[PDB]
Design a protein around this nucleic acid. Sequence first.
RNA 1: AUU
Lengths: 114, 299
Amino acid sequence: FAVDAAKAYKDYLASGGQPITNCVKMLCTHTGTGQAITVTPEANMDQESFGGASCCLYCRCHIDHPNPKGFCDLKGKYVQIPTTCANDPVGFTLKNTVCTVCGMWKGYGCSCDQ
Amino acid sequence: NSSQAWQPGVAMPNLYKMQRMLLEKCDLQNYGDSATLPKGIMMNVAKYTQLCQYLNTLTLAVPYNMRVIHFGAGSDKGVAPGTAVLRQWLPTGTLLVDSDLNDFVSDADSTLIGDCATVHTANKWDLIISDMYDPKTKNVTKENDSKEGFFTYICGFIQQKLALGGSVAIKITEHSWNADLYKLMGHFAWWTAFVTNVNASSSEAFLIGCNYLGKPREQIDGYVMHANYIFWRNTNPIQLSSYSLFDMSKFPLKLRGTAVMSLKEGQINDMILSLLSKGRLIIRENNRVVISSDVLVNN
RNA sequence: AUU
Ligand SMILES: Nc1ncnc2c1ncn2[C@@H]1O[C@H](CSCC[C@H](N)C(=O)O)[C@@H](O)[C@H]1O
Ligand SMILES: OC[C@@]1(O)OC[C@@H](O)[C@@H](O)[C@@H]1O
Ligand SMILES: OC[C@H]1O[C@H](O)[C@H](O)[C@@H](O)[C@@H]1O
Ligand SMILES: OC[C@H]1O[C@H](O)[C@H](O)[C@@H](O)[C@@H]1O
Ligand SMILES: [Cl-]
Ligand SMILES: [Mg+2]
Ligand SMILES: [Mg+2]
Ligand SMILES: [Zn+2]
Ligand SMILES: [Zn+2]
């Protein structure tokens, strides 16, 4: 047995649940690379940058990270969230994947397919 | 519309520091007024951004592999907005440790949870930031005297664990202050009390010590200096302003690559003191960073 | 003090 926090949060949102609040939005130029997870805020004109740990479901719920060493890919970094989805950064990082080639979010910046 | 409105905040002017005022009640003309911040920005992201923008104007030592410790980094939100801003401001790779009495989610390299008096470090630090405030300070039932608690720990931590050439930013308010901390400001090449423009409706200020000398360059009476600070705040209303938050193009702390060397107490001559005073030298060992929190065991 |  193991608790499935990711599925629980997705089911909560589908039921009309209020997104996790207090994700830490940073002040930045909005002239950044637009990559998904960076060492410093890299929001472009279509994104908001947030402190990574505050957007991590596992960090915020105080639960183990889902991988052998329990490593967090967000803590200590900055996550770029499309402005249209900035109302729920935890849900966005949980439901989306980063392109291992260009570093952009698949469907929100990655143009490797074209 | 005031010229100081485009700055990140206001520093206590030199002539106010030279007075001998008696302590009076703080009575700000705009006390408690709320600032209009950029959409979705937290007060402490705005406040720490303005503190860092002001620290950018000073002669901070910025060595490679800089070490920074942040006390009072937690919040009632369960996250660390100030730590997130410090992480953004400091050069990539800077070691950042944060701490708080209560558990919280942090972007720091390492977080210690417990009373700051339980925190021990084998290493010295290049920058100490404190935003600690004791909630009991709100219960004012007697004359406003110098406070002990975490301030006692901070004065000892600065004297034992701050590298020569290092700097500090320690938050104070009308009632949250310590006379020995003001006295220690005289052990730096320069010091001030800095008020952020976004929280100018508060008696809050950051006591900034720039370039630690490890010895008094001037004798400061802390009771008199806090009275001088309150007199300055009572006679100089500051207009709330978020103007500086809109231009982040020059925000990151410049990597100066400041020299780090280990010198015994006796090799610190006037030539070394001059380099320390100009932000061109950090004196400390460069051993591995090891920290711990003492745990009291009970049934 | 955590607007
Ligand atoms: N003795 C002590 N040791 C450690 N932390 C203390 C303390 N006294 C007060 N504090 C902490 O000081 C903090 C003040 S609120 C700090 C806000 C935070 N800097 C931010 O970025 O939002 C509280 O979290 C409180 O727990
Ligand atoms: O977590 C998302 C967010 O928009 O929720 C409401 C407020 O807490 C904001 O500061 C926060 O960024
Ligand atoms: O660490 C954060 C907590 O401690 C602080 O002292 C505050 O009084 C409290 O509101 C907050 O929840
Ligand atoms: O709301 C009071 C003031 O707060 C904000 O910080 C703004 O800089 C200013 O435009 C506004 O008038
Ligand atoms: Cl300076
Ligand atoms: Mg609040
Ligand atoms: Mg305020
Ligand atoms: Zn995490
Ligand atoms: Zn791609």
